[PDB]
Write a protein that binds this ligand. Structure first.
Ligand code: XUK
Ligand code: XUK
Length: 125
């Protein structure tokens, strides 16, 4: 069974736009999105579709790039570090749910390297 997907809006939570968050959407996310290994990560894991009935028994903080994209588009985040944390959660979830050497892990490893390359230098305020 699937839990509800992570929120992409929250009226109690303050919004912010920064040069770094704009870059995270326009450059980092939109470039990673086009990578040949991005497709498993473009939407929340559908455990019913994918026949992964234990996915959410293992992964308690799910995250994916579709959620991140909507959060960025909604100015959901306070700062770039909060968004970067969601990317890191997405990658770590992949390593937790699977095991070294799996195809999906090789995909996450490649995307993580590209992500780090792109966030190594961010714009300034
Ligand atoms: N679409 C996805 C996303 C993440 C993930 N971890 C293991 C499998 Br199979 N996964 C499939
Ligand atoms: N064994 C599986 C099942 C689903 C799936 N989506 C991406 C990868 Br890599 N996947 C591997």
């Amino acid at each position: 069974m699937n839990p509800p997907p992570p929120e992409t809006s929250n009226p109690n939570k303050p919004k912010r736009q920064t040069n770094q968050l704009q870059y995270l959407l326009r450059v980092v996310l939109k470039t990673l999105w086009k990578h040949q290994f991005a497709w498993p990560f473009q939407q929340p894991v559908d455990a019913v579709k994918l026949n992964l009935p234990d996915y959410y028994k293992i992964i308690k903080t799910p995250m994916d790039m579709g959620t991140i994209k909507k959060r960025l588009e909604n100015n959901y985040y306070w700062n770039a570090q909060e968004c970067i944390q969601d990317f890191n959660t997405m990658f770590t979830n992949c390593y937790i749910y699977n095991k070294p050497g799996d195809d999906i892990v090789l995909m996450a490893e490649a995307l993580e390297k590209l992500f780090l390359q792109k966030i190594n230098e961010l714009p300034t305020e």
